[PDB]
Write a protein that binds this DNA or RNA. Structure first.
Ligand SMILES: [Mg+2]
Ligand SMILES: [Mg+2]
Lengths: 218, 218
RNA sequence: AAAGGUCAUUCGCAAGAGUGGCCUUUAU
RNA sequence: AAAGGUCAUUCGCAAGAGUGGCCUUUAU
């Protein structure tokens, strides 16, 4: 079973218990799970990615590098990189389903495990990591594009035009506690739009997206 | 002069312009300054710190490791570790004076410089880093303690007791725009307290501290 | 950690930038 | 990234825990 993953990883563990720990969620084993390895892998993987980002990024301005780095270490991207490994069929869990949060954390812990198993050889681990994902990362860096959210876009418009910030007002809150529906109002000067979502922010983001369009019509 | 810093670092650079760039603020050189190196150094050092932290921490709980890690990569701590280096006498800058934010950023950039100049040798750089600071880090980790802020403590108190959170509002704002004084009000149930500070958060932190007392005195 | 506004101050013919304080938005 | 409250759900005699939703605090 593990031999398969080791083959996809291109690395054979000296300590197989270290590899399964990385693959084990707290629900399956409360004494030997990946939580602490995840803490380490996050730092480790963060380093490998930044190093690539600094070398190959077309734009080295902080406002570009920071948002892009955040995406390159996001759960989303990690799940994207993990596909190749098929972690979903090596992961051990009980009270839960192997969602994208679990996958991303196991991905991080998995890299910490390799690092440790190899006698804490960062250089070796970085290369193994690059041999597997360098191209995929450089690819995403080349097609890198920072995109602002509506709430941010809106206040930059209003701070430019009237040097003021839009007022977000909570209008309604319906539904059961585990699935609420929020209706918020965005207002600037005398303009006001509405927005709804499953969270205040989502609702405000919708509201803001409207106030922008509203303002375009002038 | 650079030779003096290399002796403190315990490493001789092949590319001196690299060491120089790490020491150079944008005010002194618009084209070759430490901004990008700082980006990378932060990631590299974060990894050095975390690795030590997962191996030597008294407590491995997320709620302990996280707050503690935050302090271990904070500007405050880096200035502490950087003292020994006397970076203040090596940093190049025009517009301003070498403050703790500068020192902290140059500390990070410097390690990025060492990393790159050594041909991206992570193991080497890590050991050089430890040779200089492992002792100080282990010591801080041994004294490691999570310090909660008043606002956090207040809502945990009010949420345990009443399942509700305190509320803040600004009472008044005094002084010039570049030096304001805020007076804020903190409340829970029928209890209200005031606090003042150079910012809303400082004011609220102060107000929260007062309300905690008010609650103890019942 | 990044983004916008703003006050002060510094460099600058200008453009524009540095530094310090404040407000807000985003991400983790 | 961490902390606290809350709803749902799963495991549990209980304590307590896991997973999903929401609110909030902190840090960068
Ligand atoms: Mg994670
Ligand atoms: Mg920094």
């Amino acid at each position: 079973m593990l031999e398969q993953l080791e083959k996809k990883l291109g690395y054979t563990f000296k300590d197989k218990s270290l590899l399964e720990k990385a693959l084990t969620h707290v629900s399956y084993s409360k004494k030997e799970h990946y939580e602490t390895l995840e803490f380490l892998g996050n730092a480790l993987v963060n380093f490998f990615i930044v190093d690539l980002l600094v070398q190959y990024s077309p734009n080295k301005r902080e406002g570009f590098l920071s948002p892009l780095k955040a995406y390159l270490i996001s759960e989303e991207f990690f799940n994207l990189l993990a596909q190749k490994l098929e972690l979903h069929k090596f992961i051990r869990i009980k009270r839960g389903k192997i969602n994208e949060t679990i996958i991303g954390d196991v991905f991080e812990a998995l890299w910490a495990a390799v690092y440790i198993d190899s006698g804490r050889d960062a250089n070796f681990t970085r290369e193994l990591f690059y041999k597997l994902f360098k191209e995929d990362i450089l690819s995403a860096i080349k097609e890198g594009r920072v995109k602002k959210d509506y709430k941010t876009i809106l206040q930059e418009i209003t701070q430019k035009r009237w040097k003021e910030r839009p007022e977000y007002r909570l209008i309604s809150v319906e539904g059961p506690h585990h699935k609420k529906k929020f209706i918020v109002e965005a207002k600037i000067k005398e303009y006001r739009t509405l927005g709804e979502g499953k969270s205040k922010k989502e609702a405000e983001q919708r509201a803001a997206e409207e106030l922008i369009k509203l303002l375009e019509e002038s």
